[PDB]
Amino acid sequence: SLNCIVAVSQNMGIGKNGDLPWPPLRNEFRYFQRMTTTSSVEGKQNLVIMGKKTWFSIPEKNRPLKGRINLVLSRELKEPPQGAHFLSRSLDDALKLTEQPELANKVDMVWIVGGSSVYKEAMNHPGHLKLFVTRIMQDFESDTFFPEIDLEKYKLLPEYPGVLSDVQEEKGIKYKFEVYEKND
């Protein structure tokens, strides 16, 4: 199974000029950290998979993302960028790696953390998928977008354990946490 996690504006934007479209929302980052870091299985870590631009968009003080194995996708790089644990040239290759002995006993959950083309590839996964979507309830000028969610294929869950249902607000920006699950 794969999990994708994203924060999206009302106009489906995720990024602008290599940064977020909105000012930083600390508590949104805290939600992302909690969901991507937490494993129920003692000793294991979750794997975060991200594109190269997403990696370099994270402040160096937060790289690698603490408590998670960090894998970057790139076809141009020849080794992981400084601080990253792994580099793959495709999502299928990254998932192949999670099955091989160097990672198979270390990794619990797999989280896809952006950007656009990585989400798009993940959404063609034949196995089970969940989409953890933070709805940023404003329009923001964006140049990178999340793809459309097919509501004949996914369902919006009424709630999810450990995920707050209530509207959040930081810096005058309202947002909320949703979880979608691929149909059987």
Ligand SMILES: NC(=O)C1=CN([C@@H]2O[C@H](COP(=O)(O)OP(=O)(O)OC[C@H]3O[C@@H](n4cnc5c(N)ncnc54)[C@H](OP(=O)(O)O)[C@@H]3O)[C@@H](O)[C@H]2O)C=CC1
């Ligand atoms: N709101 C949110 O939840 C999120 C926001 N962001 C924002 O989005 C933007 C970054 O995302 P985006 O611009 O889409 O870029 P990506 O992070 O997807 O980086 C694109 C680069 O990653 C590599 N790559 C991406 N997908 C694949 C793949 N499937 N297989 C192999 N290589 C791949 C390529 O590197 P190469 O050219 O080396 O081959 C590609 O040029 C920033 O503005 C960031 O702030 C990012 C993540 C989440």
Ligand SMILES: Cc1c(CNc2cccc3ncccc23)cnc2nc(N)nc(N)c12
């Ligand atoms: C991957 C990702 C980011 C990437 N950006 C940053 C991460 C962490 C620290 C940061 N600190 C300053 C600027 C940007 C940062 C932002 N928010 C996200 N939210 C949700 N839900 N899902 C995601 N995939 C997110």
